[PDB]
TrEMBL record, chains A, B, C:
GO terms for cellular component: helical viral capsid; host cell; host cell nucleus; ribonucleoprotein complex; viral nucleocapsid. Homomultimerizes to form the nucleocapsid. May bind host exportin-1/XPO1. Binds to viral genomic RNA. Protein-RNA contacts are mediated by a combination of electrostatic interactions between positively charged residues and the phosphate backbone and planar interactions between aromatic side chains and bases. GO terms for molecular function: identical protein binding; RNA binding; structural molecule activity. This is Nucleoprotein. It comes from the Viruses. SUPFAM superfamilies: flu NP-like (SSF161003).
């Protein structure tokens, strides 16, 4: 833990130094450096560099102005290396990629990507890290959802290093499934010589199972580079303090941070705030109920957000742009989890699925129909398993949210309970 | 459109002239002419005439009095013809029939009619126009629901002009189904020589499918004759203005109209108002949610309405009757539709049917069970089709309600969302 | 009815006299006699006696003190007999047993008991009288739920008087099922020579059916002995007045009664009050909705009650105990029923399970999916029967709750409608 906190704090420190350096090169004010659109452009440059450029926004003469600068790719690479104490440091790079992936996840639905690959467009929750490149980092591999892995594999199905890349990806997906039966199917997908339709069909099946028997997907709170640099500049030593991507650290950092965004005339700044908050804590596919309780204000479904994407296209004019503070804080914090919830065990149940009438009174007599009726090789075993599962089944027993004053996470608050972010659109009301 | 508005306006004008003429013959005051019970009796007379009579109510000496008048059937027919500029005009007749059908639909459940025909009494929504005679008008044919058509066909199943009447009715029903598979079954019902049990069974199946893959049924706002006559009298020329049964016209007319009803001692006049409002806009089987949003006050389920039927039986005494204004106006208007909603295409989906846990917190992990589990000749094709459908699926995309000031329907209001009128009774809580 | 009221009033009178006598022997104050923990100890003594003892609590010097007294079993038996006018009176004994069973039902889940017997722990509602001994009283037999009977039979399955006891119990269970098909299966369980796995499997099946096609289980309001004794002492003659276990009597008695409970530091006295109220009226497995409407304050699920059991273990110290009034009254009363609700007939339906769109507006088009899709030897007959049933189906038509002033139950109040008491726990949110 101390050693993990050490190396994590080391990469965040590197990103920080880089960002400050990059902010001096462009002679940006501290406020301008803390504009999310400027941070993304800087982030994109160091990612693309591994000439390059993008739009950079300045507060000139009372109005927001856009400049499209350029840098030699060799120069950026040198700047990144030297901010990371000589080392090539690919970890900090993929950390900024996962941040970008989390924002993509929160902003865009990729139904067009899903349909081309023959997948159901209702597989959002499975699609964490879909915009993330194939053969990403180890952290990138961990952060990718089950569906992302299924999608990547079908693209493979549609030069014997192709074989190892196919088997590596099969194993990534396998390590994510929490039931042996799901894992055993992945073996049958992997053990195939010349994979094709049977494997394709198997992978579509596995993705569906992962909507109920959910896979183990990592979640890492990853913040815009401006947040880390800002902290480094202000006198915070991530190497001496350590740092965590799943503990209290990122919540505490945002609590001591102020990020800005360019805002269009039609846009609600609070709705922009929610979007970037969601992205920051990898919460695009979380239950809106828990996201809300944690944040302390309602986390509204995508379709009821009066906001477009963070990035301002070159198409639109800057004279109508204003700049707003992004509200990225929270009432509570909570540990980010690798788990997909309970899928295994099924040790008893303990509950009530019907009533026995005591009083002679006119009413309906409620009962849990799907559960009662439920009780009436590896493919059918999975069917039987997800037929047993209930939406009412509780996961993460005993685990709760925490006060921001609760550094060591000593006193869990268990919340007494609209769930789908991408559930509210012109085709479907979920 | 101009030509449709022309001929519609022509028939409504005819009904109007007729009603005014009929109101002079009986020497009724304008208020008395605008009593819904008097209008129905006049409507019934001209329908029956194609001796006849019914109860007519007058305000005599501070109390409501009932008289049972009679007219020669030849005389009524002459009055109807001459109000319709010579022409026999059967259109205006069936328009008053559809008005009556709409009121029946709103007032009475016909479960006894359904059970005799071997149909499920939960097929309300399918039963628009059931009290309407077989071999009605073309408008009457259009207005009839899928179940009505199924019921009429089973009565046929239970003189070779019997064959053409059987095939005509099969084709009516066919033109109402929006999926080819449903249509293809109707062909198999029609192509049968000596129809019997197989056809009966097929028709019961088709009616069930029409609860999910809903048929295209016309909806026409049809008002008591007193409303048209009142408008004609007051100086509105339906021939010069044109008129529509599905556009803004009937809403606008009711906005400029005042209709009365006789009200029993136990009755809430607002609940009477809702009933006749529903009937007026053919809304008996509409989602109560949309009916409400349109009207602007709650449209309550049948079983929670403190009201009996509009018509006062000869059995009951007039000395306890009062007269109340019927509130038949609306906050908004909306176009009446022929469509049964989306049944076809199924081009992708776009939505979210599960969550992926981000935070280690105690909760249930929601998922859309029926949808996820769903994926695990013409009869089974239909089964497969309605198994794909979801209650959450959106129809009439982009289409919305309108302000009464919005004549041309330029600015649609899309409403941000108890659905069943006949769902709340002593046997069932829906 | 008069004769039933006679003998019931006779046994309650007996329990009363006994309790008063028992209260004098211990020289308890009237307040102390009306402490629920003292009443249970006295109740337990007369039950165990058919040396014996238990904890008795006194108000000594401003603090609550515990004494563990002992009595010769012969002496208690003599006291019970002589309070019941010579007669051995086993009825009053089983009445106090059913009271204990009702409290157990309300306090403890017996999932551990269920899993050992191979039953689903979600069968709470079926488990009325599970803590009640096998071969109880006739009243005890009547009060036992379907699952209790199934559990008792499997324990038999796991000395030819074993055969008669097996067949007697089969018949008890049979008389509880309201459908012939369920009854016919019990015949097949009973007609078995050397019962085993097939019978075990059949009994698990029958219990599941009883969650939807619910069995006829008696419900008897049974009160702590202190309530009866208190009434006898104060000048109420149950023999002259008669008494009922299912009519208004027990509600009226509690309305004129004051019972106390020892309360732990962490405990909410209102939540203790609910628990003992539930037990009193055999309402552990009732719909919380009806329990609430009757009582007039919310009847909260088990898991949201800030209270442990009524009985204070010898382990814990008395110096932190306080004494609180138990609120055991009710806004309304309602007749306790033998019925399991409608399971038979299925004469038509009358309802609405879909809508037909009238207005061109954007929305989802709701429909009752499970009901519509439903329509697409004795084991499958039962499957078919419970597949027809709907949670929305109404039982006890016309029957309602009553004002406490309504002795003769003349004016039923039909309530316009969280259902499961044991539905809200760390594994399941129901
Ligand atoms: O205190 C200090 C502490 C350190 C440095 C400066 C100050 C300091 N010097 O002056 C003032 C004034 C200060 C102050 O009060 N701060 C508030 C908290 N700040 C902060 C905290 C964290 N993390 C945790 O506290 C944490 C607790 C458990 C896991 O993580 C992170 N993070 O990245 O995790 C980022 C930031 Cl910016 C640092 C500044
Ligand atoms: O204006 C007039 C207009 C015409 C005649 C008289 C007046 C008029 N002369 O004096 C006053 C005062 C008047 C007035 O303000 N009115 C209000 C609207 N009235 C009305 C309107 C409609 N339809 C539409 O407006 C419509 C708009 C788009 C589709 O339909 C219908 N209809 O049947 O459709 C019935 C009636 Cl009664 C007519 C009277
Ligand atoms: O009146 C009396 C009536 C009798 C005795 C004393 C008094 C009396 N004498 O002085 C006062 C003052 C009194 C008084 O007002 N009481 C209130 C009601 N009380 C009571 C009532 C019932 N039952 C029914 O009333 C009932 C009505 C229908 C079914 O049952 C039961 N029960 O066991 O059913 C237990 C009790 Cl304690 C009796 C006392």
């Amino acid at each position: 833990a101390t050693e993990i906190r050490a190396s994590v704090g080391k990469m965040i420190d590197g990103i920080g130094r880089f960002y400050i350096q990059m902010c001096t090169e462009l002679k940006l004010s501290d406020y301008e450096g803390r504009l999310i659109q400027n941070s993304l452009t800087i982030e994109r440059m160091v990612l693309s560099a591994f000439k390059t450029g993008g739009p950079i926004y300045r507060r000139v003469d009372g109005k927001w102005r856009r400049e499209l600068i350029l840098y030699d790719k060799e120069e950026i690479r040198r700047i990144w290396r030297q901010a990371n104490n000589g080392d090539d440091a690919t970890a900090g790079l993929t950390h900024m990629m996962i941040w970008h992936s989390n924002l993509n996840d929160a902003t865009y639905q990729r139904t067009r990507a899903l349909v081309r690959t023959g997948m159901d467009p209702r597989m959002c929750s499975l699609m964490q890290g879909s915009t993330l490149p194939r053969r990403s980092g180890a952290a990138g591999a961990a952060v990718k959802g089950v569906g992302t892995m299924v999608m990547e594999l079908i693209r493979m199905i549609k030069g014997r290093r192709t074989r190892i890349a196919y088997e590596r990806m099969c194993n990534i997906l396998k390590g994510k499934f929490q039931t042996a039966a799901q894992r055993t199917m992945v073996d049958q997908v992997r053990e195939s010589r010349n994979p094709g339709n049977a494997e394709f069909e198997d992978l579509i099946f596995l993705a569906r199972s992962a909507l109920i028997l959910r896979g183990s997907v990592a979640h890492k709170s990853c913040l815009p580079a401006c947040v880390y640099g800002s902290a480094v500049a202000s006198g915070y030593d991530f190497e001496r303090e350590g740092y965590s991507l799943v503990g209290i650290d990122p919540f505490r950092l945002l609590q001591n941070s102020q990020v800005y965004s360019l805002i269009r005339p039609n846009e609600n700044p609070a709705h922009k705030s929610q979007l970037v908050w969601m992205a920051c804590h990898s919460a695009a596919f979380e239950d809106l109920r828990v996201s809300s309780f944690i944040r302390g204000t309602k986390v509204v479904p995508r379709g009821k957000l009066s906001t477009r994407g963070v990035q301002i296209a070159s198409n639109e004019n800057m004279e109508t742009m204003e700049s707003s503070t992004l509200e990225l804080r929270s009432r509570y914090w909570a540990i980010r989890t690798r788990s997909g919830g309970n899928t295994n065990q099924q040790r008893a149940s303990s509950g009530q699925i019907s009533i026995q009438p005591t009083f002679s009174v006119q009413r309906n007599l409620p009962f849990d129909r799907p559960t009662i009726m439920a009780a009436f090789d590896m493919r059918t075993e999975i069917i039987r398993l997800m037929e047993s599962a209930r939406p009412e089944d509780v996961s993460f027993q005993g685990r709760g949210v925490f006060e921001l004053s609760d550094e060591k996470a000593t006193s869990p608050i268990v919340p007494s309970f609209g769930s789908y972010f991408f559930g509210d659109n012109a085709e479907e009301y979920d």
